[model samples]
Target chain A: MKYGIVLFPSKKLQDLANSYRKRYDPSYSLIPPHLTLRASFECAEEKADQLVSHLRNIAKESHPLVLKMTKYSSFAPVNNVIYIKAEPTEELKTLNEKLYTGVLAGEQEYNFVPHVTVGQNLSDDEHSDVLGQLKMQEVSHEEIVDRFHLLYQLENGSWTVYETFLLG
Target chain B: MKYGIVLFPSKKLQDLANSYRKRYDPSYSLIPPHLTLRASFECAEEKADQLVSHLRNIAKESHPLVLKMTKYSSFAPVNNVIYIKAEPTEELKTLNEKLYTGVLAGEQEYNFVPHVTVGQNLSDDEHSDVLGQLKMQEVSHEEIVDRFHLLYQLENGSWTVYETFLLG
Candidate 1:
């Protein structure tokens, strides 16, 4: 199966999960390691090449576009699927929307959530606990989206670099 | 076995590898997909807790620190072990040094070359090719050393959250 690029989640969302793990579940099960649940979009080989070309063209035209980091919150698309939120600036939003519309047109199954998956395949009990902990406090971080990558999953079941497109 | 944090080459180093992969050898393996290799000092679990305490104290005592981004390079301490580098700020250097001195004071066999391992166990030919590619380019991107983590390996050979320490 092939995959396409999508804005998975903001750094805020990632921090939230890390903080939650630190505070409440001090000695949580290491069986399923938290990092594994971090979801990343996959891209088909040819499609990836095209995306790289598009990013390169964009770079040449306007040069490096500063990606502004804004806002924070958690999103729950379904009862159990939790996502961390970010307020993408108009520039970021435009880029994202355009890429989705032009490149990923019909490939996505769900509306773009703009979240990083903190956990997956969670049991009801585990999900409830995570939600409860998230309510305890909030956290955030800001970073410029200087580049976007074409990530590939290798035969060894690992994620490897296919290519990257710099902003400028 | 317990884990300890090792900081060698800077995040810039990792970016260099990424850039090299993007430009010259698109076919080269990036990361050993589906695998994460984290170098931990002996008794990393205990050190992680202490590291968190130290970071919290730093955050409480001073103004929140601002992080900066730096250059790009590649590091391979041993043959076939490739890692990306990022500059470690004074704060990060002090923190990591303190942890090394405090928790892993006596262990000297393992060298700390601050870097994110891009791939390991490569053939001599592969190593030569990667180094050649890296030597050909200049990489750009700056990032702050805002945080660090203490991760645990699971039975399934994946990593899980053992602890996390946020920098001020």
Candidate 2:
């Protein structure tokens, strides 16, 4: 099965993120706004239990996390992706590092840049138009997160939780 | 106000712990069975927000934790208290250390030993009798906890959650 890990922010933050996403983000309806922890990876059915046990250990060692969104930003030349940038705390860095080790070992396609997409798949002109307009205003909100979900992609292309790991 | 940090186990573990507690623990009704992380300490009412903020940061830094209770044991020479011994994971030790630093700084009355109390306040004869009987049997249960409650005692002497900090 193909699985991913993510943190779904609270309803309050989701509603705020969705206000912009409903109009600009193409994949908005495919999945709720979430912070991706581990991108999708293929796992063998027989090794599923081993992956879960290792994740459980990681969850036990991790602390609760704080997420703060300061303002809207874009991937620009890297890609025309606009997002609500998340502050990268040491705790988050540690977790991101740990998820790629041991039983969950893998490599990243790009450097770790934490964010929640608000707009994507836009033309250069549209990207410039939106990013330019959004940058004029600041996005400020903070929330506490206690759990991370192990998610699996459905045949219909929607993602749902496979298992949830709560921090100590 | 006085505050304490504790992890309450799941209902399955609580039910089994309560079976022993109702008979042997005098504080059974005072509060549900829990593993104490920070012992009760006095806090100035005005300084309460500072403590809460500090705790929020700690929560974000922590991960969900796993607890395993393998057997019943007693604090014999020091005191007549019996508990289901919890495996002392490095995560628990780190949290214990962090709580005593920064805004929550304090001294320890004793070395940190994690357990869920099932029996206490017994006479020498009763202590040996109960301990002898309980020791013969084994306690086997494990649980994952994602949050810790900051508790305060009511005038009635019952403890309640002042605030809760979720693990990351």
Candidate 3:
């Protein structure tokens, strides 16, 4: 199955992702606003269940993540992703490293820049306009990352959450 | 100001306290189901505000309390309190100890047995009735308590929550 795992802010802030994406972002329907820790990858059915159990064991020992989304930022022009910048703490980095063991350990090509995606899938002109509009606006959000979600894409081309694991 | 404090399971369990008390208890109107950390005590107005700030600092340093209610128990026949018995963990015990220092520290005549009050204000027959029904049934609940609330009695004779302090 094709699967990815992410941590989301409390359900209350999800509307920020929804509103921004409805206007300027494209993946809004396919995915909710989230911080992707490991990019989507494939595994056997048995392995997927093991991944959930392993993560629950690792996470139950850790406290819920408290993250600060301090301001608005975008990727350097070419990447085309626009996001609410999150200042990654050492605690979150340790969590990622711990989640990296065994069958789940696949690295991404890009360096991990934790963010809440607000807009993506833009042409160069569209990207320029969207970034300009969001840049000057002062924005900040503080949210608790208390649960981890597993998501998988279906054969029908829709994605669904497979499971949730609580953190401490 | 006069104040009392309690940590409840969640809104769901408050109904347990309500339904049982509607038939047998009176203070049910004055307070919800709660474990009385301190019975309502007197304080000067300025000290009450200071108490709010003080407890906030105390709570911020402490972790959220994860507790399980395994069964039903109560104070001995002399005291006559019916409670949803909370199994004591060293974590909860330490939290109470920390909350007990300073001008806030006052002795509880009875040793602390953490519990959610379900009934009080009873005659011998009433106490026996409340105990018999609760004793025959199985009872359990689990909850996370992440904050402390200070409840004050207003001059109008109704009690209101005066402040809430979040735990770490």
Candidate 4:
């Protein structure tokens, strides 16, 4: 069995993306992607419960983390796929690293890039051009991280929310 | 000339509504609604510009207003339209009141709710049932307000972006 954390973008974010899509590329389909880590747990169910509790405690004590939504860019650029750039705070970076190194070190195959993956699988050339375009554009929004979630993936590649914890 | 303010919901919020529609009512159409006010400014455009500048300054000075998306609920007990609920903070309340009383006073016809209206114009019974359901549900996500835009309404009831400001 596997365990992972999930974060849902705020409604405002969804609106921004939709508008961006309609304005820039109405023909393409929008895939809602989230950051997930592959992890091996001794007892998947029990560990998932414990993880939720741990996250709940952290949320209770921490301030809402601030994040920057940068320009339009993508990992694989040549395909012309565009996504809002995100830069998590140092606190978020630390939390992400802990989750990756502590719980998911063994099972995860790919290195982490702290992005929400608004668009993916772009061609190399599209990716480069998008990055260049991103540099010239101004960041349109910033987001606050006030909650986190634990999600379970089903056999059909769909995900269900297991639990959510709030931050102040 | 009458002056009014058009509050545009953030991109994330638009996405949230879209997702909910996909899951619950795929046929529902999404439209941008404006909150109109009757202000006393001689030059509506000048007042709108000033209001945008003030809001941008305040957003930069104050930490981004954080919000928790707890559950789905209805404001009117009689209407059954389901909408997302956000935990309102002091910062949000303060800004809202300030904008309404200071910038929009005399220019707007009605009071401001400072809420993102997900659904409006519902029947009384639907509202009541939805409100009851919300009382039992828990909040699911949290968000921060890091940017805002000033929008104007056209003759066709469509909105055009007047100005956009980002939080520091």
Candidate 5:
């Protein structure tokens, strides 16, 4: 089974993120706007129970997340993905570090950078033009997230919730 | 730093386990009588913070453990260790599996048999004699555990808590 942990922002933030994603991000329908905590990992069917219990424990130790999505940003040289940049608060970083430490612990592909993707998979010229236009439109949205979901991917490449973990 | 996770039973259970341990177990003074959840693992000093946060999360997700110590048991074929065997309840096995799945995960040295060791490092004849006598006494104890500890070894060859995680 494939599982991933993520924080889905409030509807307000999601709508705003979607406003951009619907037009530019190809994965907008594959998964809702979310901040990835632990990326997708493979686990045996029998191990899912252990994974679920592990996630619940992590949630119990966690508190509601406060996200300040202040501006549009891009992973330029690395990729063409654009996102709503989140302030990497101590609480957020600690949560990410914690998730990567225990049973789900693994080598992180990148340094922890909190964001919700608003746009992705564009040609070089399209990315440049879209980013330049979006950068001019200031974005400032604050959201309080009280829970996160463990999502499993469907055969069609879309993701759905397997379980939800409530924060303290 | 080397660290381990364990469930320390109530004082009543501890006193009883110790009564036997003091007389039979060689590692009695090295560590308190405990149900080892995650055995000692080497972690870098810098990673301690992450590990602590991870443990706190696991603790929050966990409930007070219910233990039933019913009789004397031995690992005679495997080793000369004898213990107050805990019933392998679902809660106990799940907790053990959870601990072994995440960041602190590694190969388990033994199967998940819950027990509090009372005697070890004995000659074959001594173990057989002690087992025969203890089996005849008939032990039964039940306990509710609300917390577990992360312990680190000191230079004096004794263990002390690094942090305590309270179960839900």
Candidate 6:
């Protein structure tokens, strides 16, 4: 099984992302409105229940995360996705480290860039054009993330929310 | 009277900053260790009391701020104040804008840059030297800021805590 620990913004901010994403990205429907902490990690289905408890424990005592976004950025040469970059605040980074320890200690990635991907699956030409357009027409907004959800991806590649962890 | 709205970190973080500030900054002893949201706004005694009530109302819904800092930065050329730059999350920024809206609206001097000032009052050469040293030997840490204090500047230059507003 594959999973991601992600934070969802409120409706207002998610609607704003959907406005741009609905026009640009092909995979917008497959993905939800979210900022991911851990991306695409594998775990046995037998351990799924234990993993949920581990995440719930981590969420306890942590305050809600407040995030902001102003413009669109992309992974130009590497990937076609255009994402709303969550401000790289230390609190977000610290939480990433804390969650990765203990239960998630072994399955760690290189770095965590907090963002909500709004668009993907574009040709090189389309990617450049849309990236330039968003660069010029940048917008600003703020959102509070009080809870994060555990998303599970099935073998067919459909994604669904497995569980939710509310912050203290 | 002059007043400042500020938040203080835990003793561990304060002691860490003090060790650095006591050696570098001249105003280390004059001002208590704190992060100011609004600094040195002039208002009458009666109005200051009213402003306190206004802030208290705003603080009622605000949550505690989880913040972190890794290194030192400076406001050079325009001024030389070597300080620890804080992670300006939405909770912190949102609370700031909320408090600034009513009574303190027109009295604000400059745009708020969330930071803890560790060093000030140095020549051009000294600023560069300390900045470079701290850059190489910079330490990292995180802390939570819950309640904020309203501080008043007395006649002879000492500051006294006027009121404390706890976040609900």
> Per-prediction DockQ scores?
0.08, 0.01, 0.01, 0.03, 0.01, 0.01
Q: Write the per-residue lDDT of candidate 4 for residues A35-139, one digit (tens) a residue.
A: 333332444664655565566665566566665777665645234556676674676666665554533445543444455444445566655655676557776
| Candidate 4 segments whose C-alpha is farther than 4 A from its true place | A1-3, A20-43, A58-61, A77-82, A101-111, A123-137, B1-168
Candidate 5 residue lDDT tens string, B69-164 = 998999988999999999988888777777765666657634688889999999999899889889898887998887777766544344545456
Residue B104, model 4: lDDT of 54
Better of 3 and 5 by TM-score: 5
- lDDT, candidate 3, at B72: 71
How well is each residue in A54-128 modelled by candidate 5, as lDDT tens digits? 888888999999999889889987899988899989988878877877678788657788999989988999999
lDDT (tens digit, per residue) of candidate 6 on A33-54: 6788775687786787789788
Kindly list the per-residue Cα lDDT of model 6 for residues B1-168, writing each as its tens digit: 678777766545666677777788765544545787575687787666579789889889898798788678888877888888888788887887787688777755466778888888889998999899876676687877667876565433434444567688
What lDDT tens digits, residue by residue, belong to model 3 across residues B59-100? 888888886887776675766777788888887777676667
Interface RMSD of each: 11.6, 16.2, 17.9, 13.0, 23.3, 24.8
- The better-scoring model by TM-score among 4 and 6 is 6
Q: Which scores higher on DockQ, 1 or 6?
A: 1
Candidate 4 residues B131-159, lDDT tens each?
A: 56546855465566554544443332223
Task: Pick out the ten consecutive residues of candidate 1 chain B with the lowest summed lDDT.
Answer: B29-38
Better of 1 and 3 by TM-score: 3
For each candidate in the order shown, give its overall lDDT on alpha carbons.
Answer: 0.41, 0.79, 0.69, 0.49, 0.77, 0.73
Name the best candidate (by DockQ).
1
Candidate 6 residue B87 Cα shift, in angstroms, is: 1.1
Lowest lDDT block of 10, candidate 3 chain B: B154-163
Residue ranges of candidate 1 with Cα displaced over 4 Å: A1-48, A59-79, A101-104, A107-110, B1-168
The positional error of residue A40 in candidate 3, measured at the CA in angstroms, is 1.2
**What are the runs in model 2 whose C-alpha is more than 4 Å off?**
A1-168
**lDDT (Cα, 0-100) at B134 in candidate 5:** 90
Q: The CA-based lDDT of model 1 is what?
A: 0.41
For A16-133, candidate 3 gives per-residue lDDT tens digits of 6656876776665445567885677787866766887887787788788887887678885667888888898887777777767776766744666778888877788888888888
List residue ranges in candidate 6 displaced over 4 A.
Answer: A1-168, B107-110
